[PDB]
Each structure stands twice: as C-alpha cells, then as structure tokens.
Amino acid sequence: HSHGLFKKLGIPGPTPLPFLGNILSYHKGFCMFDMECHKKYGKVWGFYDGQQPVLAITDPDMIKTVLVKECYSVFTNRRPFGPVGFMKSAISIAEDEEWKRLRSLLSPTFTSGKLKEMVPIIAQYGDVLVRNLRREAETGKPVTLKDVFGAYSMDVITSTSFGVNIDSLNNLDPFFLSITVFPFLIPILEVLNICVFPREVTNFLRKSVKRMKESRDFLQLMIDSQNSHKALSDLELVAQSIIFIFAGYETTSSVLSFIMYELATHPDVQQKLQEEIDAVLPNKAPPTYDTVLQMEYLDMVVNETLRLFPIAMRLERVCKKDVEINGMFIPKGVVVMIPSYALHRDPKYWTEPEKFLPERFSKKNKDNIDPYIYTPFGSGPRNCIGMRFALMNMKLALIRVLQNFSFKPCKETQIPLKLSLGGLLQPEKPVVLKVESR
Amino acid sequence: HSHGLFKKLGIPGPTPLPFLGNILSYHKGFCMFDMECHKKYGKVWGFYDGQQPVLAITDPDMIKTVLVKECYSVFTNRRPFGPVGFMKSAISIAEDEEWKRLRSLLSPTFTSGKLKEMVPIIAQYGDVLVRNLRREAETGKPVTLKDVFGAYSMDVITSTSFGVNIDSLNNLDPFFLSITVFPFLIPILEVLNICVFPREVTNFLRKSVKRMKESRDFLQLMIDSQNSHKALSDLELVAQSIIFIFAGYETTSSVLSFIMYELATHPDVQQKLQEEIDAVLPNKAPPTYDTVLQMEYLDMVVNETLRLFPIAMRLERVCKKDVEINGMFIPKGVVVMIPSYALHRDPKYWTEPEKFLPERFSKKNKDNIDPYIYTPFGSGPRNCIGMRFALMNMKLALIRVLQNFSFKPCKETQIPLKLSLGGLLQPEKPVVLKVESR
Ligand code: HEM
Ligand code: HEM
Ligand SMILES: O=C(CNC(=O)C(F)(F)F)N[C@H](CS[C@H](Cc1ccccc1)C(=O)NCCc1cccnc1)Cc1ccccc1
Ligand SMILES: O=C(CNC(=O)C(F)(F)F)N[C@H](CS[C@H](Cc1ccccc1)C(=O)NCCc1cccnc1)Cc1ccccc1
C-alpha cells in the first residue's frame, strides 16, 4: 500500500513486491544493490524495505543538507532499531533530545586531549600483539588476521574502557530480515523482554560495572562526567560502555585485516609505509601520539582502505517532518539513505575506483575529494563520536606491527578479496597471510 | 517493568499488577475509578494502562499549562489510537504539524458566520422531529429517547455535511481492553488492513464522496477550502466527514437524552424553560440563530447537563518531551490525563454536586466557575472544534421540542439514572419518558 509514494513523487526506483518491497534484491548484498541502483537511476531513487520507503540521495549538497544543515531540525535519528531493551539509552540508538543530551555528556570523553592520555595504555598492548605475532612468526604457520587482531582489539577495549587488563589471546541474516517484513513485531518483543544483546551479556556488564564503580579509561571519564542537562545515570553508563565495546571490537579488527590484505597484495605500499615508520621512529622507536599524526603516508593508507571498505556501508536518517531540500520534496517518516559504499566506488568521482591507490589522499590530491562523497565516519553533529580514537588506535597498531614484521600472501590468501554477501562489511573468507620477522 | 516510574517520581497511586497495570480497576468504569483516586490521593496521582503510565492532574493552573500554555510545544497529541487505517488523516487523530495543518484548513468551516448560515437547514428537521414526536404522542406509548433523537441527530448530520436530506426515522469492551494489554499489536493490525471503522463504511463514504464531488454544508466548505499549507486532499476530505458524522451522531443524541431525563425529573426547570422559550418566541415562533443565544436559562440547562454527563469523561495529552510544569517533573511518553467527570462532581468546587441545579450557571454564579475545572469541550488550541455548532444544534432541537411537547416520567423511567459501566458515557438503560402535547 505504501508502495505508491515514490510513484506519486515521481522518483524512480525498482518496482516493489507486496509484503516484501524490494528486499529480495539484497541477495547480492546492500552494496551491490546500491551500485546497481546508482547506475540504473542516477542521482536520486527510492525503494522499500518491506513497507518502509527508503530514499537514496547522492548529491553532495543534498548530503550536506541532510547530514549537517537540517540534522537537529529534521534528520536527527537513525531508523528505529529494535528490540533493544535498556540499550534504548545508548547514544547511537537514542533519539532527539535524549541523544542530544547523551552526546554532550559523552563528547568531552572523546577530545584530542583525553585521547593523548590514552595512547600509552594503547601502546602497551602492541607489545603483546607483537610477541603474540612473533610466536606465530617463528612457526610461520600462516595467520588468520581477525583472530590476532581481534585479540588486540579486545585488549584495547577492556583497558581503555574499564582499566581491566588481559592477554585475551592467551586467556541480511534470518532475524533482521524478518524485522523488516514484520517491523510491527518490534514492540511485540520489547514487552517479551527479548534482546539482540543477550540478556546475559548485558546482565554481566550491568553488574560488572557497579562492582568497579564501588571498588574505585572511558568508564572513568564517564563517572567523572556524572560528578547542565541531568548528568548521567547508572544503567545509562553501562549501556554506553557496551556500545563502546561493540564499536571498537569488530571495527578496529575488521579494518586492520582489510589493511594487511591490501598491504600484502601491494608490497610496494608496505615498503613505503615501513620506510616512513622507520624514518620517523628510528630503531623501531616507540610510537607516540604526536609521531602518529606526523606520518602522512600511514594516514593515506588508512583512508584508502576505508574508501574500499566503509564498514558502515550506508548512512541513514529518519525524516521527522515534511521538508524540501535542494528542490526535492521529502515526506515525513521516509528513511533518507546515503549509499557510502556506492559513492566510494563511483567512477564519476574516482579514477580507477576498484584499485587500491593511496595516492588519492596525497597532500596534493586530498584537496579534490568531496567530504560528502567520502564519509567513512559519517558527517555532521551525529558522526562517529569515536573517529579520532579509532584512527589513533589502528595507526598505533600498524606502526608497531610494521616495525617488526612484513606480510606476504599465502596460497590460501583469497586474491582478490570477495566481500560477505550478508549484512556485514566483512570478507567472504578470512584473511590468511604470511608473517615474516624483520 | 515500567511500573517503577511513578514510584521513583514519588507520585502516589494504586499499585499496578504485572502485564495489566491498574486496568482491573475499570470494572466500575473510568469515572468511578477516577473519583475514588481523586479522593484517596488528592491533587496528582499516577496509574498504568498496562505498561502505559498515566498521570492524572487536577490543579487548574497545571491544567491550563497542559491544555493551553504548552500545547504546541509538549502536549500536542492525544494517546495513540489505532488501528485506524487511512483515518490516521482525520483531525482528532492526527499529530503535531499534520494536525496543525488540518486544524487551520478546517477552522473557518466552524466559524460563527458559517454556523448562522447552517441554522435554517437545521431548523427544517426540527419540524420532522416534532411531527415524528406527535405521531408517538397521539399514541402516548412511552418513548425511548435515543431513537427519536438519534434519528434527528442523523437528519442534521447528513444535511449539514453532504446536502443529503432524509427522514431517517422513516427510511471497556473486549477489543480496546485487549488494546492496552497488547498495544504492541496496533502495528500488527495496520499491516493487516483491519480497522475499527469497518472497511465497508469507509469504503461506502470514500466513493460516496467522490460521487457528490463530481456531481456538483461541511463538504462544501471543505471543498471550497481546497480551492498556505498544502490545501486539502480527497482521501483526507472523506476522513474528516466521517469524523464529523461520528462526532455529531452519538453526542448530539446522548446529551439531548440526558437533558430530557433531567427535565422530566425536574418539571419546574422544564416549565421555566418552556416559559423562556414561549416569551422570546411567542406563538411557538420559529427559533432563529440570534434568539437561541438570547435564551440564558436554556444555556444554563445545557451546561448543567454537560456538567453531570461530560460525554468525554477524560481529556488526554501525550507528553512529547521531558517537562516541568508548576513544580512537577513529567517524563517523556507519559500520558497526562485531566479527569473531567471527577472534577465536574468534585464537592470541593461544587456545592451539592450530585444535584441537577441549573442555577450554578446563572449570570451571577457563572463567574465563580473555573474554566479549567468545567471543561465539557476541553480547552486550548485543540478543544472541540465543533463546540459552537453542537450547542446551536442541541438548543435548536430543545426549543422546537418544548414549544410543542412536555415530558413526564414513566414507571419504566430509570429513576435515578444509572450510568453505563462500560467505556461510553451513556445510561445503563435507555431513557423512556412520556410525551404530552401542549
Ligand atoms: C574504523 C573505525 C570506525 C569507523 C569507520 C566508524 C564509522 C562510523 C560511522 C559511519 C558512523 C555513523 C555516522 C553517521 O551516521 O553520520 C559512526 C557512528 C558512531 N560511532 Fe563510529 N566508527 C569507527 C569506530 C568507532 C569507535 C572506536 C567508537 C568508540 C566509541 C565509535 C563510536 C561511535 C558512536 C557512539 C557512533 C554514534 C554516534 C551518535 O549516534 O551520536 N566508532 N561511526
Ligand atoms: C455535546 C456535544 C460535544 C461535546 C460535549 C464535545 C466535546 C469535545 C471534547 C471534550 C473534545 C476534546 C477536547 C480536548 O481534548 O481538549 C472534543 C474534540 C473534538 N470535537 Fe467535540 N464535542 C461535541 C460535539 C462535536 C461536534 C458536533 C463536532 C463536529 C465536527 C465535534 C468535533 C470535534 C473534533 C474534530 C474534535 C478534535 C479536535 C482536534 O483534535 O483538533 N464535536 N470535543
Ligand atoms: O545498519 C545496521 C544493520 N541492519 C539493521 O540495523 C536493520 F535493523 F535494519 F536490519 N546496524 C547499525 C545500527 S545498530 C549497532 C549495533 C549495536 C551494538 C551494541 C549495542 C547496540 C547496538 C549500533 O547502534 N552501534 C555500533 C557501534 C559502531 C560501529 C561502527 C562504527 N561506529 C560505531 C548501523 C550503524 C553503523 C554505524 C554507526 C551507527 C549505526
Ligand atoms: O477515549 C476514547 C475511548 N477509548 C480509547 O480510545 C482507548 F483506545 F484507549 F481504549 N475515545 C476517543 C478517541 S477516538 C474517537 C472515535 C472515532 C470515530 C470515527 C473516526 C475516528 C475516531 C475520535 O477520535 N473522535 C470522535 C468525535 C467526537 C466525539 C465527541 C466530541 N467531539 C468529537 C476520545 C476523544 C473524545 C473527544 C474528543 C477527542 C477524543
């Protein structure tokens, strides 16, 4: 029934099926479907997640309007995700004024100053990562990257969020598809006390927090925060910590795997990066905060990897009122979507876009890139609150790992890398590479 | 789970049962439960329709704050009623800016000027009401009032809304209880294309409207309206007409029955009213617009009946943001309720409140009544848009009916009147009275 909307608005798009919309086109993933629609339709098109109208926009002025200019007024919130339980109080899920408050209380936590104070604790677990890598390098047995990296990613998380310090390494799915064909079942589950975050994990940390709270990182800065608006609660403080672990876990690890695959399949870039790391940090010097920002080619590698593998795939905002933006009428309730992956690989902006070419982000060419076409961390008042931390975290990992080791493909290394057909931006097969000691 | 809210806020109220809240206390009706809570708790108290927190307020300053001062900002909408289908576009159901637009387009329809132009068409069907009454008066067979009145109420509706002219007389229930224990099933039904307004009635009028629309009252003024904002649609125009029929049907008839019962059980008031009607309209003169407003004692009878029988029972607003009003913090999502029936019978404001005493509204005493304690039509920007029309409609009915007939109780007349234990403000048994010709 709601499938007449875009037709009335005269916006092109694939014809929807009843009770499914256009969801059957997700068989090749969000990304392939985004690019095919970008090609066949042009600057704007609509489709239907079930009965939910989604409007893709690709014009950077319109993207700036949505993500920045009209954020507070119209496009404040992401599409209603649930069932979430108490995790409704987490910042990336909260809406309107509740989010606007949580953002203010959590923004000073992620300042450049606090991040610098976090570097030495991040610095220690690289040595763990190095020695755990050196144990597998002596063996030579080819390495699955998501393990060794995911262990390191966990080491940073538990340390940077709760002062807990562990050697972790030594110590489009069925449901969410059913969500968009039966989103009238979200409130069904909120009264059923079900949660996509098992009622045990949240229970574990909810009481684990109040142990550390009353026995005495992010938890510190957050506890210091609740010392205008209305300060911070105790259940809310737990929810944010959970959203920080989830955030920094499968993102820090996934990107670092994407980088090692790209460095291995481009040994020249690996050498030029190893040259820059050795020059600024002679004798495998311990990386510091300021030296990390000093390395431009390392930043060029990171951004180029994030261009080919934007973990988020898309950016979304719920249109809370009828609005006109840059000549286009958009009705209330519509989900406006910015196809990040499809823009990061648009030939109309990127020369040879399928190729890993760090020199696009050279200090010369970094000026030609539109910040509303390249958006690995989103943009506007509701961008990645942990952008600077994530970049610092990953760069500190790459530096110490390239001071000691070089990485070579193995016969099992999936060349070229095929992405996961599911709802996650991940490789089909895990990245397996050879680790050689310098 | 949501049952901890008021406890935290320190607001008193009945202790709720799981998965039911306090709904089992509706066995004696909304009204009896409201008065019992007013007595036992005082100025403010909360309770739970299932998991839904409802906050009753009784302080007129707070009532003015909710209904008037903070209407546009915070308390714009009534509690989400559904499943409604396309009737979501009807004004009494619409929310926020959509309602604010529908109100503007429909406000000039209900001006005092247009109402005066509607009187002669309303005047004609009183003669129908009189002659249909005279046929039953010759017989004398005691009369059930909701029939004869409901027929007249229909005659006004179809005439005042579509120019259709008929002699109609000659031509807390199970579901909504399940609504508040399973309100997570409202979106379940919106996708099931079910409706509490059968898919045939709405279908009947939706196509019946476009017949009269393309062949060529309220429909006229509305059609003239769609000739800023965005004008009016065709489906929306039908929805409003349906909400006008529903409005003016069981309300015009229910109140007029409540008035005849009260006039019959108080023959003195009936005589003093018949005296005023004869004096201003000698020789049973045809009532005019201006003469109706000239009659003060008739207005006193109407208001006093509406004090004892406020059809709406309660007034409700959904609190769309966290707010403080007159020293009381109110969290988001709470339903703020104004117990009209319980305030209209509060002895702390009304001397001998159970008694039918029109002299409370005498030009002398009408000054002492607080318009935030007496609210038969609500108050503020979202009051009864059809207040003036309804009063004019009912007064024109009473005048011509009292110029010709007098009304006496019968042995079957339920003295005293017992109200319906359900969710409607209606009598237990229908009102049966004796009709004598003057
Ligand atoms: C490579 C690493 C990361 C990438 C590429 C990334 C990217 C993004 C993107 C695209 C968004 C959505 C922006 C928008 O919708 O406009 C976002 C939001 C967010 N990110 Fe990240 N992120 C990364 C790491 C992190 C880390 C380490 C944290 C640690 C707390 C974090 C916390 C958040 C939060 C809380 C939000 C939601 C903010 C809000 O809703 O106000 N992210 N991120
Ligand atoms: C004895 C007759 C009537 C009584 C006692 C009455 C009373 C009320 C009350 C108490 C409200 C709610 C006010 C609030 O929540 O603040 C209301 C709203 C409303 N009434 Fe009436 N009413 C009567 C007749 C009518 C008639 C004849 C119409 C014809 C159109 C009508 C149309 C409406 C509408 C559309 C609303 C909702 C307005 C909005 O939501 O913006 N009513 N009425
Ligand atoms: O789009 C999708 C897929 N499918 C659907 O949602 C639909 F239901 F439709 F099927 N997932 C997300 C929205 S939930 C995501 C999971 C989460 C985890 C713990 C607690 C609560 C919630 C969350 O909120 N934070 C993650 C932290 C992060 C990760 C990466 C970068 N920065 C921060 C989209 C998203 C991505 C990035 C930022 C914000 C939102
Ligand atoms: O409260 C309750 C009972 N129970 C519950 O709602 C809960 F779901 F919770 F169980 N019903 C109403 C809210 S629906 C009511 C029905 C209706 C009819 C046709 C099309 C759509 C909707 C409507 O909207 N208009 C009526 C027109 C009117 C009648 C009388 C005076 N003026 C106007 C409360 C209400 C009363 C008065 C004005 C506004 C709202």
Largest Cα–Cα distance in chain A?
A: 67
Residue type at B334? V
CA torsion B93-B97-B101-B107 (nearest 10°) is 60
In terms of phi and psi (left: phi > 0; alpha: psi -120 to 50; beta: otherwise), the region of B24 is: alpha
Nearest CA in chain A to B96: A321
Residue type at A125? Y
CB B167 within 8 A of CB B148: no
Residues in chain B: 438
Residues in chain A after which the chain is broken, C→N over 2.5 Å: 171, 216, 227
The Cα A383–Cα A402 span in angstroms is: 30
Ligand 4 pocket test target in B33, B47, B81, B110 with most atoms within 8 Å of CB: B81
Token representation of residue B279 = 């004096």
- Please, what is the end-to-end C-alpha distance for chain A in angstroms? 64
The Cα A259–Cα B168 span in angstroms is: 80
Alpha-carbon torsion B373, B374, B377, B383, what sign?
A: negative
The Cα B382–Cα B91 span in angstroms is: 10
CB A432 within 8 A of CB A147: no
Most B CBs within 10 Å, among A74, A101, A178, A184, to test the B interface: A184
Rounded to 10°, the helix A145-162/A112-139 angle is 150
The Cα A392–Cα A51 span in angstroms is: 41
CB A390 within 8 A of CB A256: no
Q: Which residue has the tokens 């800023």?
A: B228
Ligand number nearest CA of A238 is 3
Taking the CA of residue B379 as reference, the ligand 2 atom at the shortest distance is 16
CB A144 within 8 A of CB A256: no
The Cα B376–Cα B262 span in angstroms is: 17
DSSP-derived 3-state class of residue A434: strand
Interface of chain B toward chain A, CB-CB under 8 angstroms: 1, 51, 97-98, 183-185, 187-188, 190-191, 193, 321-322, 332
Residue type at B64? K
> How far is CA A378 from its chain centroid?
9
This structure was determined by: X-ray
Nearest CA in chain A to B193: A1
- How would you write A272-284 as a 3-class SS string? HHHHHHHHHCCCC
Strands (E), B18-149: 44-49, 52-57, 143-144
DSSP-derived 3-state class of residue B430: coil
What contacts B341, CB < 8 A, 6 or more positions away?
A: B30, B31, B34, B35, B310, B313, B314, B425
Burial class (CB within 10 angstroms; exposed 0-12, middle 13-18, buried 19+) of A113: exposed
Q: How many helices (H) and strands (E) does chain A have?
A: 17, 9
Token representation of residue B437 = 């010709």
Closest listed residue to residue B91, CA positions, set B247, B323, B229, B280: B247
Burial class (CB within 10 angstroms; exposed 0-12, middle 13-18, buried 19+) of B172: middle
Closest listed residue to residue B54, CA positions, set B386, B331, B289, B272: B331
The C-alpha angle with vertex A243 and arms to A238 and A248, in degrees rounded to 5, equals 130
CB A398 within 8 A of CB A148: no
DSSP-derived 3-state class of residue A416: coil
Judge: B97–A321 Cβ closer than 8 Å, yes or no. Answer: yes
Pick the CATH number of A1-438 from 3.30.390.30, 1.10.760.10, 1.10.630.10, 3.90.78.10: 1.10.630.10
The Cα B328–Cα B330 span in angstroms is: 6
Most A CBs within 10 Å, among B52, B184, B186, to test the A interface: B184
Closest listed residue to residue A269, CA positions, set A180, A381, A358: A358
Burial class (CB within 10 angstroms; exposed 0-12, middle 13-18, buried 19+) of A45: buried
- Min Cα–Cα distance to chain B from A175, Å: 17
Resolution in A, one decimal?
2.5
